């Protein structure tokens, strides 16, 4: 039983083969969800499911450095349903993040910020209840 | 061994199976392919491409009912034209894991879940093969 927003510390930074697993439930009339892998006030990887952008559901990914966003990467596969439980797994590899939801591959996001040791927090927020958040090696 | 080569997987694939392949990339290689086959379906296709829009990339996918799915792509590219390599593929309960020259390269979650039905590993494209075997670890 965790609270939201939740900043999961990643004390040593991220490394290849780290698998982060987040379990929770989408709030019944959710509008947005966010996972932010942060390096200080910069966001190495922002993963943002939007339940209604111009009447579509879309996940937007991007990077924030010095208070500026970059080029968005967008994906319409949308495995989240309002009110329903979900398992998100983020696998960190040497060149990208890979995300799977409910054990199914969703997307990949190539590293823009290359200093993986400095990514030391994962911010989890938006319209969810959070049951658990941890990581392991695979 | 001669390429293309089909490595039989007599009891299919199962967690803890390790496959080890040694060969050499041809100096003018364009593509390499490892295909875990179940009939016409390919549970996991591993496809290093040496020149796709002037980049090297590895493309992974699954073919089921004659249709490919969503690709997983890797820019980490451990193969060099002309050079020997070692590929190991470990089957785990949740995914295949692939290491090249003893370094982790990628993982690929299972999409086709009936692993015991995978009967052959096809090895082809721009390589020469010194050996290919499987063991349980
Ligand atoms: C170079 C660029 N200039 C712009 C200008 C505008 C935008 N627009 N237009 C709509 N929304 C955006 C922005 O897109 C970003 C992704 O590219 C972030 O998602 C950004 N954003 C969302 C959130 C957020 C905060 C929360 F508390 C949440 F719970 C939550 F779920 C999301 N914080 N920042 C969002 O405002 C994008 C860009 S890229
Ligand atoms: C839903 C989809 N619609 C498309 C449309 C086009 C493609 N494009 N566009 C370029 N190449 C592709 C295809 O990507 C596939 C993986 O997603 C396979 O690699 C597919 N392919 C390569 C090979 C192959 C055969 C050989 F004998 C080799 F030696 C060898 F090294 C590779 N067999 N099949 C390839 O043609 C992909 C997709 S997925």
Curated annotation (Swiss-Prot), chain B:
Location(s) in or outside the cell: Cytoplasm; Nucleus; Secreted
Q: Which residues form a coiled coil?
A: none
Q: Does the keyword Cytoplasm apply?
A: yes
Q: Does the record bear Transmembrane helix in its keywords?
A: no
Question: Which residues get modified to Phosphoserine?
Answer: 75
| Alphabetized UniProt keyword annotations | Acetylation, Cytoplasm, Differentiation, Disulfide bond, IgE-binding protein, Immunity, Innate immunity, Lectin, mRNA processing, mRNA splicing, Nucleus, Phosphoprotein, Repeat, Secreted, Spliceosome
Q: Which domain of life is it from?
A: Eukaryota
According to the UniProt entry, its GO molecular function terms are:
carbohydrate binding; IgE binding
Please tell me where this protein is predominantly located.
cytoplasm
- GO BP of this protein: cell differentiation; extracellular matrix organization; innate immune response; mRNA processing; negative regulation of endocytosis; negative regulation of immunological synapse formation; negative regulation of T cell activation via T cell receptor contact with antigen bound to MHC molecule on antigen presenting cell; negative regulation of T cell receptor signaling pathway
Gene Ontology CC annotations of this record: cell surface; collagen-containing extracellular matrix; cornified envelope; cytoplasm; external side of plasma membrane; extracellular matrix; extracellular region; extracellular space
Q: Where is this motif: Nuclear export signal?
A: 113-128
Where does the chain bind a beta-D-galactoside?
68-74
Give all residue intervals belonging to the Galectin domain. 5-135
What tissue expression does the UniProt record report for this protein? The highest levels are found in activated macrophages.
What the protein does comes down to: Galactose-specific lectin which binds IgE. May mediate with the alpha-3, beta-1 integrin the stimulation by CSPG4 of endothelial cells migration. Together with DMBT1, required for terminal differentiation of columnar epithelial cells during early embryogenesis. In the nucleus: acts as a pre-mRNA splicing factor. Involved in acute inflammatory responses including neutrophil activation and adhesion, chemoattraction of monocytes macrophages, opsonization of apoptotic neutrophils, and activation of mast cells.
| Subunit composition and interactions | Probably forms homo- or heterodimers. Interacts with DMBT1. Interacts with CD6 and ALCAM. Forms a complex with the ITGA3, ITGB1 and CSPG4. Interacts with LGALS3BP, LYPD3, ZFTRAF1 and UACA. Interacts with TRIM16; this interaction mediates autophagy of damage endomembranes. Interacts with and inhibits by binding NCR3/NKp30.
What name does the UniProt record give this protein? Galectin-3
Q: Span of the full-length protein shown?
A: 128 to 264 of 264
């Amino acid at each position: 039983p965790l609270t939201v927003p939740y900043d999961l510390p990643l004390p040593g930074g991220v490394m290849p083969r780290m698998l982060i697993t987040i379990m929770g439930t989408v709030k019944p009339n959710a509008n947005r969800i966010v996972l932010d892998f942060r390096r200080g006030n910069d966001v190495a990887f922002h993963f943002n499911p939007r339940f209604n952008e111009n009447n579509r559901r879309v996940i937007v990914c991007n990077t924030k450095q010095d208070n500026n966003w970059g080029k968005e990467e967008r994906q319409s596969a949308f495995p989240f349903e309002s009110g329903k439980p979900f398992k998100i797994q983020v696998l960190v590899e040497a060149d990208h993040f890979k995300v799977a939801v409910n054990d199914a591959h969703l997307l990949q996001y190539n590293h823009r910020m290359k200093n993986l040791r400095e990514i030391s927090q994962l911010g989890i927020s938006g319209d969810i209840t959070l049951t658990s958040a941890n990581h392991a090696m695979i």
